[PDB]
Amino acid sequence: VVGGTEAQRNSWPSQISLQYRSGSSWAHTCGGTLIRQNWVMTAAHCVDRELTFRVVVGEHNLNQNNGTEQYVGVQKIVVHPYWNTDDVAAGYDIALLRLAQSVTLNSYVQLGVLPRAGTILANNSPCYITGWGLTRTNGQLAQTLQQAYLPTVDYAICSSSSYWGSTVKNSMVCAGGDGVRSGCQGDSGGPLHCLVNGQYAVHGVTSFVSRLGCNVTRKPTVFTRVSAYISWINNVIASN
Ligand SMILES: C[C@H](NC(=O)[C@H](Cc1ccccc1)NC(=O)C(F)(F)F)C(=O)Nc1ccc(C(F)(F)F)cc1
Ligand SMILES: [Ca+2]
Missing domain, CATH: 2.40.10.10 (Trypsin-like serine proteases)
Structure with a gap:
């Protein structure tokens, strides 16, 4: 921003950080929105690369323990059938990610x-x-x-x-x-x-x-x- x-x-509190594994660490690449305890909404172009992804809910400072984070793997990726990487101007830039497990909701993690x-x-x-x-x-x-x-x-x-x-x-x-x-x-x-x-x-x-x-x-x-x-x-x- x-x-x-x-x-x-x-x-x-519905804000998540979508991260991919690079080397041993994990790097932030995109945002997303938690829409169910086990589903995240994000942009289809963020998952065009076949990377290992994880989601971080309850996150505030990327580089520091906040004491409120939950780290979950991405188990299934569903991008819009009409999304085309070579044409973002066509639209359909949306994808849903099923998480490996359901996150716990509290004041930092909400739908x-x-x-x-x-x-x-x-x-x-x-x-x-x-x-x-x-x-x-x-x-x-x-x-x-x-x-x-x-x-x-x-x-x-x-x-x-x-x-x-x-x-x-x-x-x-x-x-x-x-x-x-x-x-x-x-x-x-x-x-x-x-x-x-x-x-x-x-x-x-x-x-x-x-x-x-x-x-x-x-x-x-x-x-x-x-x-x-x-x-x-x-x-x-x-x-x-
Ligand atoms: C540097 C700039 N980057 C972007 O717009 C990229 C996301 C992106 C890139 C490509 C495709 C979809 C989405 N995003 C960002 O910087 C964002 F986080 F603000 F969204 C850019 O190239 N924008 C752009 C590219 C192509 C077009 C075209 F679609 F008209 F061809 C319009 C804007
Ligand atoms: Ca943190």
């Missing part, structure tokens, strides 16, 4: 609340992006969970020529674009939490930013619109 502030330890199918937010709706991604374009990962206020930019404005044009689809949410605050590499797969009827719900899975930089004026951060995928999510969990 570029232009973020450090998040309190229990503010966003994310998903929107109703079909729900579209009005322009400039209040949302926060969270994650441990790069804090500057071409910078480095954050050690502690970051958050940034990233109001929605509706489809009509985001698909206009000065913004993303044809690259953004209606299966996506755009948020930000002020040149200051944005998601950045390592935030992918994570939540866009939006306040709807006094409740934060996860309306976006972080997908992409401009080739030109993370915080680029009129290039909002782009998210997979979770409410476009509610029937697919439920059909996957129901069968696995």
